[PDB]
Amino acid sequence: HHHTDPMVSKGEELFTGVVPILVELDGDVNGHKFSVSGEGEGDATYGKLTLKFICTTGKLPVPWPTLVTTLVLCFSRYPDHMKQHDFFKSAMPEGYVQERTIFFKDDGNYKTRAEVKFEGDTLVNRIELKGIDFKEDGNILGHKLEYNYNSHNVYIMADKQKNGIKSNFKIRHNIEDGSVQLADHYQQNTPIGDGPVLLPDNHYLSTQSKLSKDPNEKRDHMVLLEFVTAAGIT
Structure with missing residues (x-):
């Protein structure tokens, strides 16, 4: 609402209230094609997301918890003294690309590419996911994961060469x-x-x-x- 840096003001201004969110994912895991749609709202003031996702092609072929990280970090709450470090909002409204490779230990991998940007007043996250080399009897295609999720801290670093950021981190899924x-x-x-x-x-x-x-x-x-x-940052 009041920042001495006009670049920070520009990004904060787009996230000042509750923003509607639309998520689209088109996926293919070991040749099972599926789509997910999600709708909800983000409130960056509290760092809060609320979303509901639907598999629009029938039964989801992988467990829902494996898609949480894939299915909008611009709604993170950055404390006032850290707002000059908020890459995610500073890229808006034109948006950013978020690319991941996710390796499931002893199992297959997800390769995801997403565009996160505004369409009008709606923040859209449009994702393509390709999953390969999964074991039919493994924890993922066998749906052996519990329906829950652990809290996690993730380290963000700048990539000055690419004018972007990078992160590597581990998620633990309960079986x-x-x-x-x-x-x-x-x-x-x-x-x-x-x-x-x-x-x-x-x-x-x-x-x-x-x-x-x-x-x-x-x-x-x-x-x-x-x-x-x-x-x-203290």
Whole structure:
């Protein structure tokens, strides 16, 4: 609402209230083609997301928790003293590309590319996902993961050469038998536009996610509440 840096003001202004979100994913995992649509709202003031996702092609062929990181970090809450480090909002409204490779230990990998940008007043995240080399009897295609999600801190670093950011981090998915399925993420983000962006000092994001079901919904779906806060600069 009041920042002495006009570049920060420009990005904050687009995220000042509740912003509607649309998520589209087209996926192919070991030749099972599927699509997911999601709708909800983001409130960057509190770092809060609320989304509901539907598999529009029938039953989702992989477990919903494996898609949480893939299915909008511009809604992170950056403390006032860290707002000059917020790459994600500084790239708006033209947006950014978010690319990942996700390696599931002892199993296959996801390769994702997403464009995150405004269409009018709506923040859209449009994703293509390709998954290969998964085991039919593994934890992913065998749906052995529990329907829950662990809190996680992720380290963000600038990539000055690409005018973007980079991160590598591990997600632990609980398996029904009490064990864990590791998912190693590599991520890079680059701006879509050619204007300047804020390139951050090293810092981390703290995330927490809660998964639930809509008791009146017959389609395969996931309801997601996420909180993300930046930290690590004193």
